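Key idea: predict the complex, not the pieces.
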Amino acid sequence: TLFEVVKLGKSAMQSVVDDWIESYKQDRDIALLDLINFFIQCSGCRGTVRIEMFRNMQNAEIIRKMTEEFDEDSGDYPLTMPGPQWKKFRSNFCEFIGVLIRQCQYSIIYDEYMMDTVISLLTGL
DNA sequence: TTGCAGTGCCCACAGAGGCCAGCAGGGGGCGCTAGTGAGGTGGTTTTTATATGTTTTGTTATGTATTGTTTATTTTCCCTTTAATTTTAGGATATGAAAACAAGAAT
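Result:
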């Protein structure tokens, strides 16, 4: 529930950034799954990415499936819904990306693992 | 004149072939109808589309609460100066205790 944790009043953004760093050092797959799930539920898609469906089958059919499994109740998406709670949601989202990527610049960002999948999925979407 | 060898004629029943009704062969043209097949029109609904009313969303303005700012009255740390207050002899007191005297008592 990293989408909800980042959204619903995160006390310290660097704290959950370090939590994601610790989970990635523990196991790359689960932290990558959590980051992808965070991005998908940040896109307004209420579908949840699973371990095998992230690991095995590719990103374009993931995009097609989440287009089929968007599960909307309205046409609005979290980038345009009214204001306050969602405005601070968007700010926390941007700051989480910035702090998470910038904090790993010393040793983690040269493992050549997360950026391939992240770039592929984000480019496809 | 006759017997014999050969001819004439008349009939008749077969023999034959045209005449004729009967009958079957292939094909042309009409009287009439059941049964679909398709095409056109009308009705129905229906579905898209359009417009109106209500409500939801976004924007604006006012009031309250929070943070900051130079005063500003504590307040408090640090002097130099007294006002109790304490300590050390120095003399006087007192209350005791021997010491001498005087008074019973004994020898």
